[model samples]
Target: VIPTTAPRTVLIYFAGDNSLSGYVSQNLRAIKEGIERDGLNNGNLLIYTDKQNEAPQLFQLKLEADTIRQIVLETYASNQNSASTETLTQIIDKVQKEYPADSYGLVLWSHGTGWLPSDIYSYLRSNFMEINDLASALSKYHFDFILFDACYMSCAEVAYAFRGCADYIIGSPTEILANGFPYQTIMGDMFKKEADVVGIATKFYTYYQSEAGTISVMKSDELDELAATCRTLFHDKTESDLFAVPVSELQIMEYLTPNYHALYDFDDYVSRLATEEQYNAFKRSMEKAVIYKATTPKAVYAYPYPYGSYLPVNKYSGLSIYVPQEALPKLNEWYKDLEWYKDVYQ
Candidate 1:
């Protein structure tokens, strides 16, 4: 039974460890450093790691007299199993059942390509989790914050989709480095009375190589207003206007392919295509909704992407926009399945 007095802030690390085993280990060290930095009272940090067939297990952190303990609670089969809706739900459901904490937070750690695999990635696209499906699964639970320690998850469409599931959503609108969030910096912050998601997220932004990192903390409650602003502007736009945006001017996250222009700065697109009136209204919501955000003029160009062919991030909007790929009707059809498309456009 959940004790009525239980009020610890719990941070769940959903580590979908496939190839980044070393990176995951470093993160554990970071969390250890965090415990050393401020002690464990800040949060009850729990982890579920499925690192390269190491026997998927759920463990909790505890510090007693400068010594740390990795207390394993349960183990599961098939590391691949935990990345899906069913496994994710099972773990979270158990989180609530076992830890009757007052407030909750989660960090999804893995190689995340926002929303889902595009048409170009037909190679087992089913392997990656769809943004909407994850959102639906998470909606059944409550969270004070849900931080994405994965690449390309800070998309505007993504934060908006989870508006009903969490209080704040923090992530990168770009491809994050192999080493994700600075757990050493944010672990204690994660357990603060009101847990400063923005501060925690900002600490991460400050740590990354100027051009290699971007982070944002979004207030879920304010997204609908921004959505309304987008609806007003899109009602009068066309495909040509969207395509006119250059990659340099756009806040491109990961160059997954030559055509993955889906992730760009939302306001940059608005300022270019929409009227100042429409842009300003949306900007107001953005001002309120985004608690903290930052980006560098340049980012480490992914090897797949061409170098010396992009523009610097002149001004940052802190969230990514999903521009429709009009050339592929099948891909364009994918947007309809997204909550952002249906909620804002419909």
Candidate 2:
């Protein structure tokens, strides 16, 4: 039986400005149908589509916290640029105030190049929320999960930007197909239970895997412990080189493809990169690292290859490492500890 208490709430914000491509519309419809099929037709899903036809119309649907679903739709025009952020913030506030859910999840559906300079219609240029902006906007309320339905949102830098905003993040380190997830199968499962963020993320990954498409999802709760180990490992490196950093998470896939394209498991990739001794060191450091397994046969590869050559191989393998500004100097002191990094960086 459906729980009397609302299990969770999800907000899907689609930033499809005037120049939305055909692919965007097609996927949008699919997502809508998926939500309806999952028994959310009455109310439970909120969708916002930025379109010129409905400049000022915003649809709001509300459900009792412990009962049915709630939905809201807002359509904005190209000229309504200044109010985008405000509209989003207001909606979020409203949801928090009205639903007061135990868990909240957000899906930002749009075109993203992951920190790279791009000119797509919905590029969300400096005008939209960047990592820091999102962090600031969400400072008051923490979400259970934040899913980026756009392309290339699964990079370490992006995750760092969201360090404390959400417990888990779901996105692709590589280019995701225009058609995102099979919402039909996943949405019901998500609303049926009060699962933790990881559980929801895994279900999405599994859905993608069933579709025969490559995907990846990573949890952010492990950042604290992972960062600690990474810092130690970084200090141990003795190499002296600067690595070419990718602009966004998707670019990381491109960066690592040429050097490490073998379809090996994430663990195998780590093992291959480090000597037995280094591997042992990593294991010891990560003893406390929050770890999650990929539901599919996805693998993690090294970075930096020509665009379009590398594809996302894992469905549940991504991580984040965090360090404070005050700890910067200390990292240099442990330079020798990260011989591999030093060499790689050089």
Candidate 3:
């Protein structure tokens, strides 16, 4: 990547109005701290929020050395039924045209289902961006980093989706704390020249309850390589009983729905099914792809949290795989549609 005269700006698009509407203001507060601690340096902290039927508002958070003020850039008259790839794409276009950065970093702040069925409450599952949809929307431009301050967005499938669009992806494989990332710390890190993607996620580990603040930073290029190795592992298997280990017994990720547990620990599970040599190759790929990860020993599950009460984490792989489970029969077909699957499937 070549250097640019344009400064660095991170666009945080908040899609509220759902179950998490009440927390947007709290997140905004975190961003404010970031601005005060580290001046924008001419780089913009752009925020776009859509919480209700009322027109969405866009604001630019400005900082002069240490002083800070947020300006209402504009309000969009257009209203959409829900957040989608098109909605996100339009926001990116507007942000880039108005405040072009030497490089871009995108923070998708919304509810997510990772690589599972995008719609948690809908029949079609179109409320959130799926891997392929997100890949297509972001295909227009590349970002220095892409972070998802949403639940279940750190699965390997999600990383592979943006293989060509971002250098690093920072997100969680389980239900992220309602507070989300420590914005002041994360934003401060993003603006630096080196841009510590892993360090930003590490803040989550420091701020949250044990095992509750799970986060991972993945290198998109390394993800591609990891998938290639996964394909080989699949090709060599002839047992005919190949299948994904259930999250119930053990998993790297928890779930939003009983039918959707898309995240499984990478090496811990695969190594058992793989030969010594193939497992060695897979480990090399996993190490390079995941880069950095941090999580606690226990997780607080939601209402039905899928297996009664709590989710325990013993072996920390720092990465999760989109291994198809038997809960959802169509899961494999749905998984097949993702960019990550092709590399690992055939």
Candidate 4:
């Protein structure tokens, strides 16, 4: 593949909206500000937004003279499923054709539930995109980096599936506030000479340091080694045996949703199962896989019920992992079909 004159191309795909609709404009303004402030002129920043009650559109953010312009690219019919694989493929193909660049990056902005199937956490309707489907849609195109502006996306299982898709992955292991990324600084970071991934994660961590936040930048190339190490440890353990591995004291990554309790601290869970020598190898693999990680002392979650909103962060591995449970028979069946399950658990 020949390098194009344009150095970089970034597509910020806003899948859908529920309670996050309000932050769209605020983030967009901050995006423009970052481009303007940094005088970013060598790249194309394309934004595809599908918000409620509005027709979905794909537009390019062009930096001309002193202003960042929104050049209309394509508009689609209302009520289109932006979460669908076809829609994602279409947008990506269109971007490649319309704004070809030497390198590419992706930002997935929407609600997330690690590896759970759609509608499991939904009260409105089934709009969530599955992890496998997301990986499938992106298989044909390799990105320089992929950033998640959503929550629970930095899961070890999710990273394993996306190992071949990007050079780096940026996301949180826990729920981020509705405000999402600090677009003000991160926008500039993304447009920098090297697509400063560590800079992006650091800015996000600093921006939310006083609040509920946890983020990491995963080096995608090292993810397979992490999975290989996990396989060595997990091969002898059955689902029942793995499920029975006492987690009462381990650091939990996800609060108990009505439907499931799947996400847990990756290192914490592995530490419980691996001997000191084995755990050291896992740690080395993890160090390479998760290049950068930052967290506050506690992460906050809210719902009507009182299971407690504050999750203490005694330990953070920068990625969460699913711990199989006998309670979720349906989810357990679904988990087996994932690449992580096949590779790690035989």
Each candidate's lDDT (Cα)? 0.73, 0.48, 0.73, 0.81
lDDT digits (tens) for residues 1-346 of candidate 1? 5434534556555555666788888888988888778775535777887877587788888887778888898888764476677887788777777876777888888764655554435522313447878888888887988988877777778888899999999887777766778888887778777877878977887787454677898999998888887888776556665555565555555556564455667777667767778777888989998879887676544546334233466667888777665454555677778878876766
Question: Of the candidates shown, which would achieve the greatest lDDT relative to the real structure?
Answer: 4
Whichever of 1 and 4 has more lDDT, that candidate is 4
Enumerate residue pairs that collide in model 4. none
The order by descending TM-score is 4, 1, 3, 2
TM-score of candidate 4 relative to the true fold: 0.92
Off by over 4 Å in 2: 1-3, 18-21, 40-43, 52-78, 82-87, 115-129, 196-212, 235-239, 243-252, 255-278, 281-346
For model 2, how does the per-residue alpha-carbon lDDT over 263-343 read when each residue is reduced to its tens digit? 122333344345576677656544433233343343222223322333444323343222111222343333323222333
**lDDT pick, better of 2 and 4:** 4
In model 3, the runs with Cα more than 4 Å from the true position are: 1-6, 119-126, 209-211, 236-240, 244-248, 257-260, 305-309
Residue 43, candidate 4: how far off, in angstroms? Answer: 0.5
